[PDB]
Design an enzyme around this catalytic site. Structure first.
Site, PDB file in Angstrom:
ATOM      1  N   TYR A   8      45.885  49.593  39.294  1.00  0.00           N
ATOM      2  CA  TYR A   8      46.271  48.865  38.345  1.00  0.00           C
ATOM      3  C   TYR A   8      46.184  49.437  37.094  1.00  0.00           C
ATOM      4  O   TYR A   8      46.964  49.234  36.229  1.00  0.00           O
ATOM      5  CB  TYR A   8      45.337  47.456  38.166  1.00  0.00           C
ATOM      6  CG  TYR A   8      45.506  46.461  38.920  1.00  0.00           C
ATOM      7  CD1 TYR A   8      45.920  45.167  37.999  1.00  0.00           C
ATOM      8  CD2 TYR A   8      45.808  46.252  40.216  1.00  0.00           C
ATOM      9  CE1 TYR A   8      46.278  44.132  38.647  1.00  0.00           C
ATOM     10  CE2 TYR A   8      46.171  44.903  40.779  1.00  0.00           C
ATOM     11  CZ  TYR A   8      46.386  43.909  39.995  1.00  0.00           C
ATOM     12  OH  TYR A   8      46.835  42.890  40.248  1.00  0.00           O
ATOM     13  N   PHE A  51      35.782  40.290  42.817  1.00  0.00           N
ATOM     14  CA  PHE A  51      36.138  40.098  43.921  1.00  0.00           C
ATOM     15  C   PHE A  51      35.022  39.664  44.782  1.00  0.00           C
ATOM     16  O   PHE A  51      35.362  38.692  45.502  1.00  0.00           O
ATOM     17  CB  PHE A  51      36.627  41.494  44.542  1.00  0.00           C
ATOM     18  CG  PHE A  51      38.077  41.901  44.490  1.00  0.00           C
ATOM     19  CD1 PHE A  51      38.426  42.840  43.568  1.00  0.00           C
ATOM     20  CD2 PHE A  51      38.869  41.333  45.200  1.00  0.00           C
ATOM     21  CE1 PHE A  51      39.701  43.122  43.439  1.00  0.00           C
ATOM     22  CE2 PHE A  51      40.411  41.419  45.332  1.00  0.00           C
ATOM     23  CZ  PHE A  51      40.640  42.506  44.252  1.00  0.00           C
ATOM     24  N   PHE A  98      39.637  32.563  33.615  1.00  0.00           N
ATOM     25  CA  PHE A  98      39.826  32.770  35.046  1.00  0.00           C
ATOM     26  C   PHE A  98      38.586  32.080  35.892  1.00  0.00           C
ATOM     27  O   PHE A  98      39.056  31.568  36.830  1.00  0.00           O
ATOM     28  CB  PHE A  98      39.536  34.332  35.377  1.00  0.00           C
ATOM     29  CG  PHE A  98      39.179  34.801  36.732  1.00  0.00           C
ATOM     30  CD1 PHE A  98      40.172  34.541  37.618  1.00  0.00           C
ATOM     31  CD2 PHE A  98      38.145  35.260  36.884  1.00  0.00           C
ATOM     32  CE1 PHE A  98      39.796  35.064  39.049  1.00  0.00           C
ATOM     33  CE2 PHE A  98      37.618  35.641  38.170  1.00  0.00           C
ATOM     34  CZ  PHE A  98      38.572  35.549  39.303  1.00  0.00           C
ATOM     35  N   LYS A 133      45.350  36.852  34.879  1.00  0.00           N
ATOM     36  CA  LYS A 133      46.136  37.513  34.175  1.00  0.00           C
ATOM     37  C   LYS A 133      45.568  38.268  32.734  1.00  0.00           C
ATOM     38  O   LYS A 133      45.753  39.088  32.353  1.00  0.00           O
ATOM     39  CB  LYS A 133      47.609  36.676  34.019  1.00  0.00           C
ATOM     40  CG  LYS A 133      48.779  37.485  32.998  1.00  0.00           C
ATOM     41  CD  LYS A 133      49.338  38.881  33.596  1.00  0.00           C
ATOM     42  CE  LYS A 133      50.167  39.471  32.652  1.00  0.00           C
ATOM     43  NZ  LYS A 133      49.548  40.048  31.474  1.00  0.00           N
ATOM     44  N   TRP A 148      48.571  48.596  46.843  1.00  0.00           N
ATOM     45  CA  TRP A 148      47.305  48.233  47.532  1.00  0.00           C
ATOM     46  C   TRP A 148      47.283  47.142  48.500  1.00  0.00           C
ATOM     47  O   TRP A 148      46.724  47.181  49.494  1.00  0.00           O
ATOM     48  CB  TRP A 148      46.197  48.225  46.282  1.00  0.00           C
ATOM     49  CG  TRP A 148      44.850  47.776  46.801  1.00  0.00           C
ATOM     50  CD1 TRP A 148      43.888  48.607  47.299  1.00  0.00           C
ATOM     51  CD2 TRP A 148      44.234  46.332  46.944  1.00  0.00           C
ATOM     52  NE1 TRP A 148      42.620  48.023  47.583  1.00  0.00           N
ATOM     53  CE2 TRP A 148      42.941  46.541  47.573  1.00  0.00           C
ATOM     54  CE3 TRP A 148      44.608  44.982  46.705  1.00  0.00           C
ATOM     55  CZ2 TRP A 148      42.186  45.400  47.661  1.00  0.00           C
ATOM     56  CZ3 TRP A 148      43.919  44.079  46.878  1.00  0.00           C
ATOM     57  CH2 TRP A 148      42.538  44.435  47.319  1.00  0.00           C
TER      58      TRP A 148
END
Ligand SMILES: C=C(C)[C@H]1CC[N@@H+]2CCC[C@H](C)[C@@]2(C)C1
Ligand SMILES: C=C(C)[C@H]1CC[N@@H+]2CCC[C@H](C)[C@@]2(C)C1
Ligand SMILES: [Mg+2]
Ligand SMILES: [Mg+2]
Ligand SMILES: [Mg+2]
Ligand SMILES: [Mg+2]
Ligand SMILES: [Mg+2]
Ligand SMILES: [Mg+2]
Lengths: 304, 304
Positions: free
Chosen positions: A54, A74, A140, A168, A295
């Site tokens: 990224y 994650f 988020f 984002k 990925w």
């Protein structure tokens, strides 16, 4: 699933091997895994590898902060699948004051102290840029348990919501922090169309590869936290085709978003509005799109 | 615009030339065209050619009825573009009892007597099969001026509505009539899923090719009658891409519907449910799809 051609060349941070060892090792020491199988599955995912894909132009002494933050996010993303919206919101809200550094962590609880220590270390490194990631992260986190997930959505409505759920804005601020790339409010306002376009690509590429994982989750996890919310299911429903057919069509749309990115970048430069900061920034977003794809194609998180 | 690969091969009725001359000739004699430019444009479209591509296995002495019906529906479709929804509705509703034969036409009004005489001639040829076309035609007519056209739609809602506005059902009943292909109610219930899928293909292929014409119409004709209602604009807005980009994505979706047609037909045969009548019917549907595409990509109606 054969991806349509892309002109994007994915790049990976050169320190990916050492940083992945460091960061995986940290989480293996501190995070609470239910068994050895889970520990192996964690390493298999390659959370630091996606981070390095990224942000391949991250500064060498900053890439590890990004790896740590995406890794812990994650892990939490997965935990929320076994919670109600109410429970997930409570879980996340508790981490917000801790992230700010306003509240000490319970050191008996790994997620609390990992979050606390991480953000303290980021502010120690670059206070101004670290602080600029806070609200994008909270936005988020709050999207993750938004009741809109339990309401039917069309494609446009989904993508508007998913820009928050896909993080984002946090990814943008984290990219800037990791590169030490500072932009003015005018520069930031200037690339909003470019940002919105890029978020659809990130979102849908993820949706395409993570569909099988998420379908299984919708069948086995919490009735709210595990709910199937994805462009793949939405397109399959609207067009009355299989999920695999919807993936093929969505992939073509991703390439149209790639074309639009190039068009928007060209136009920014053409109307005399491309600064050196903005040039680095929009190129940065390209790496996010191609890296996310590379990925997603290879990670065991989605393939098994 | 490069169409992606397809395994559907089009077929054209053997009598296309002579039937075209016959049917074009009739409308040139009776229909109120405004001027010579419009007469030439009418012949240039090839309405009997598309009919012969739709129903290439029609009986030799029935294909002309289908050419007449589709030709008059095309002409009316164009007239409606210069009317409000209300005017269009009043216009179509007048023709419905006349189509039934329940009300005599005003012989000084070409659309009325053309419609009356056509349906009378069809009932004379095959009364039962002709009657089965009536309500599907009326369903289509009423969809044409439905105010849902002027309200927001997502892709799914559009396709559901467009099944009526594209005349899927009338084209099916007309196909059967033209072939003398009688199916039982149970047989028809078996292929409903196949019909629904075929409708999406006809709709979107037409949308793709007729977009430039419809865009121009939207800017120049009646703001209601000429309103832009099409999957090209809907997908472009949902995804925030150009119309050209949407066409490319939509074309891939059409190929997905072709795959689905083949799968559904194979399943029907495997389960021992494909009667000889149904075998002829589903093959007939395939001709509509490929014939629609061949004509759409070649007709001057869409290219000029
Ligand atoms: C960096 C990525 C590969 C994105 C993929 C999806 N995950 C879900 C967990 C939280 C992250 C921000 C992210 C949206 C990152
Ligand atoms: C048989 C076709 C090629 C369809 C193309 C579009 N036209 C518009 C006029 C009314 C028809 C039913 C149709 C939908 C037929
Ligand atoms: Mg997830
Ligand atoms: Mg998530
Ligand atoms: Mg996902
Ligand atoms: Mg029309
Ligand atoms: Mg029409
Ligand atoms: Mg059209």
């Amino acid at each position: 699933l054969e991806p349509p051609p892309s002109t994007f060349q994915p790049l990976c941070h050169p320190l990916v091997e050492e940083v992945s060892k460091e960061v995986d090792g940290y989480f293996l020491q501190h995070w609470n895994f239910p068994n050895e199988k889970a520990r192996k599955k964690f390493v298999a995912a390659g959370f630091s590898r996606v981070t390095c894909l990224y942000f391949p132009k991250a500064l060498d002494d900053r890439i590890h902060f990004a790896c740590r933050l995406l890794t812990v996010l994650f892990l939490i993303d997965d935990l929320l699948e076994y919670m109600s919206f109410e429970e997930g919101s409570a879980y996340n809200e508790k981490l917000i004051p801790i992230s700010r550094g306003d509240v000490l962590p319970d050191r008996s609880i790994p997620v609390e102290y990992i979050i606390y220590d991480l953000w303290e270390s980021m502010r120690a490194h670059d206070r101004e840029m670290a602080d600029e990631i806070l609200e994008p992260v909270f936005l988020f986190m709050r999207a993750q348990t938004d009741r809109t997930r339990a309401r039917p959505m069309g494609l446009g409505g989904y993508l508007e919501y998913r820009e928050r759920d896909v993080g984002k804005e946090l990814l943008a601020a984290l990219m800037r922090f990791s590169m030490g790339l500072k932009l003015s409010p005018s520069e930031l306002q200037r690339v909003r169309e470019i940002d919105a376009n890029c978020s659809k690509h990130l979102s849908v590429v993820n949706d395409i590869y993570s569909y099988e994982k998420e379908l299984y989750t919708s069948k086995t996890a919490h009735s709210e936290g595990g709910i199937l919310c994805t462009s793949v299911q939405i397109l399959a429903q609207e067009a009355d085709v299989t999920a695999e057919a919807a993936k093929r069509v969505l992939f073509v749309m991703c390439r149209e978003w790639e074309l639009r990115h190039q068009l928007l970048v060209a136009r920014l430069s053409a109307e005399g509005l491309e600064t050196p900061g903005l040039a680095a920034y929009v190129e940065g977003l390209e790496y996010q799109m191609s890296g996310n794809e590379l990925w997603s194609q290879t990670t065991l998180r989605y393939s098994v």
